[PDB]
Each structure stands twice: as structure tokens, then as C-alpha cells.
């Protein structure tokens, strides 16, 4: 649980501020995972492309 | 307890990529791992809310 669970969600919420604090090509990784972190990680991806374009 | 908020995130994660910036996130309060992505995707929101 801590590995395949824990980790990721504490290294996706990373990703997340990284992107608030103008890091608009941060990393998101697992975006190939099959369970809910694909699911998060996917929809952070959508996001971070989201504000780049808001970015002009 | 870990499945169902994970989901109720991203889709928070979701109203906010597309617009919705009064999206309500849940789960702010809590002390695990979902309280910090909680945490992470309210601030995300407030600086994209208060910079429009
Ligand atoms: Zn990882
Ligand atoms: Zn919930």
C-alpha cells in the first residue's frame, strides 16, 4: 500500500504544486496506470496542458 | 476510503482544467496522503481564482 498507493499520491500532489508555483512543464508521471492513480495522473496531465495554453 | 476519494479528486482536477474554478474539493481536512493531495489541488485552485 504505501509503495504502490502512498507514494505516487504524495509525488502526483508534488506535481500539483509544482504546476501552482509556475511550473507549467513539471513532470507527471503514471500516466499509464490502470487503477486510480492513471485516473489522477491523467487528469493533472489534462490540467497542466490546460494552463499552458491559458498561458498564452 | 482510498479508491473513492482518489476518483472525487480528479474529477475536482477535472472541473478545474476546464474552467470551473468554484469547484468545491473535499477532503481538505484529512490527515493522510488524500488530506495532502487535498490540500495541494485547494491552493492550485485559490491562485488560479485569485490571478483571473
Ligand atoms: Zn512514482
Ligand atoms: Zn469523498
Redesign the pocket.
Known amino acids: 500500500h504505501m509503495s504502490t498507493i502512498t507514494?505516487?499520491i504524495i509525488?502526483l500532489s508534488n506535481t500539483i504544486d509544482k504546476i501552482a508555483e509556475g511550473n507549467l512543464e513539471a513532470e507527471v508521471?503514471?500516466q499509464n496506470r490502470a487503477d486510480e492513480i492513471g485516473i489522477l495522473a491523467k487528469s493533472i496531465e489534462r490540467l497542466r496542458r490546460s494552463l499552458k495554453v491559458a498561458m498564452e
Do not use: G, I, L
Open positions: 507514494r505516487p509525488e508521471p503514471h
